[PDB]
Amino acid sequence: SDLIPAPPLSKVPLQQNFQDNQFHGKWYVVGVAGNGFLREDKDPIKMAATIYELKEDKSYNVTFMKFPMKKCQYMTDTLVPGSQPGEFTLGNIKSEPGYTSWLVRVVSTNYNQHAMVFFKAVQQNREDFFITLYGRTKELTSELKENFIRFSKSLGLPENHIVFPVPIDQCI
Ligand SMILES: [Ca+2]
């Protein structure tokens, strides 16, 4: 009853010279892909803003809709500095009563338009991973979306594990 094994970090690019002070602010989740959820027809992933606040200790406070982003419930957690700039540990992506935490690698960004971010369970026995496509706006180019499908598939994901939330539903 297990998941598609997570890729090694060797297959995941890291944004070089990551600028933490340009990555802060509001990002929309334009695309989500992962091994741990299915493209539900009658309960779709909602588009939600994610807020990054940069702290003086170079952590971020991050505010986001709880995964898997089907209920209009938000949480705040912390991105703690990882091995390099642009890589972090995140404590939680939802209510997690088990021994669970997340490695976060900013794969690519241009700060003012798009980002792609990789997440994988830290725990040795866990295979959970996902990728988010961030937009400063609710819409991104065909080119940016196709590149997200490309990256997502490169990590073993089939098409039914890749979703683009409708840039609508402010969770009324
Ligand atoms: Ca946790």
Curated annotation (Swiss-Prot):
Q: Which residues are glycosylated?
A: 61
Task: Give the InterPro entries listed for this entry.
Answer: Calycin, LCN2/LCN12, Lipocalin, Lipocalin_CS, Lipocln_cytosolic_FA-bd_dom
Any single Gene Ontology cellular-component annotation: specific granule lumen
The organism is Homo sapiens
Task: Please name the GO terms that the record assigns under molecular function.
Answer: enterobactin binding; identical protein binding; iron ion binding; iron ion sequestering activity; protease binding
Source superkingdom: Eukaryota
> Which parts of the sequence bind enterobactin?
102, 130
The cellular location(s) given in this protein's UniProt record come to: Secreted; Cytoplasmic granule lumen; Cytoplasmic vesicle lumen
**GO BP annotation list:** acute-phase response; cellular response to amyloid-beta; cellular response to hydrogen peroxide; cellular response to hypoxia; cellular response to increased oxygen levels; cellular response to interleukin-1; cellular response to interleukin-6; cellular response to lipopolysaccharide
Q: Name one Pfam family in it.
A: Lipocalin
PROSITE patterns in the cross-refs? LIPOCALIN
The record's function comment reads:
Iron-trafficking protein involved in multiple processes such as apoptosis, innate immunity and renal development. Binds iron through association with 2,3-dihydroxybenzoic acid (2,3-DHBA), a siderophore that shares structural similarities with bacterial enterobactin, and delivers or removes iron from the cell, depending on the context. Iron-bound form (holo-24p3) is internalized following binding to the SLC22A17 (24p3R) receptor, leading to release of iron and subsequent increase of intracellular iron concentration.
The Swiss-Prot or TrEMBL record describes its family as follows: Belongs to the calycin superfamily. Lipocalin family.
Please list the tissues where expression of this protein has been recorded.
Detected in neutrophils (at protein level). Expressed in bone marrow and in tissues that are prone to exposure to microorganism. High expression is found in bone marrow as well as in uterus, prostate, salivary gland, stomach, appendix, colon, trachea and lung. Expressed in the medullary tubules of the kidney. Not found in the small intestine or peripheral blood leukocytes.
Q: What is this protein called?
A: Neutrophil gelatinase-associated lipocalin
The record's note on quaternary structure and interaction partners says: Monomer. Homodimer; disulfide-linked. Heterodimer; disulfide-linked with MMP9.
Where, by residue number, does a carboxymycobactin bind?
A: 48-50, 121, 130, 134
Tell me what gene encodes this: LCN2
Keywords, in A-Z order? Apoptosis, Cytoplasmic vesicle, Disulfide bond, Glycoprotein, Immunity, Innate immunity, Ion transport, Iron, Iron transport, Pyrrolidone carboxylic acid, Secreted, Signal, Transport
Induction (UniProt): Expression is activated by the oncoprotein BCR-ABL; BCR-ABL misregulates expression via the JAK/STAT pathway and binding of STAT5A to the promoter. Induced by insulin.
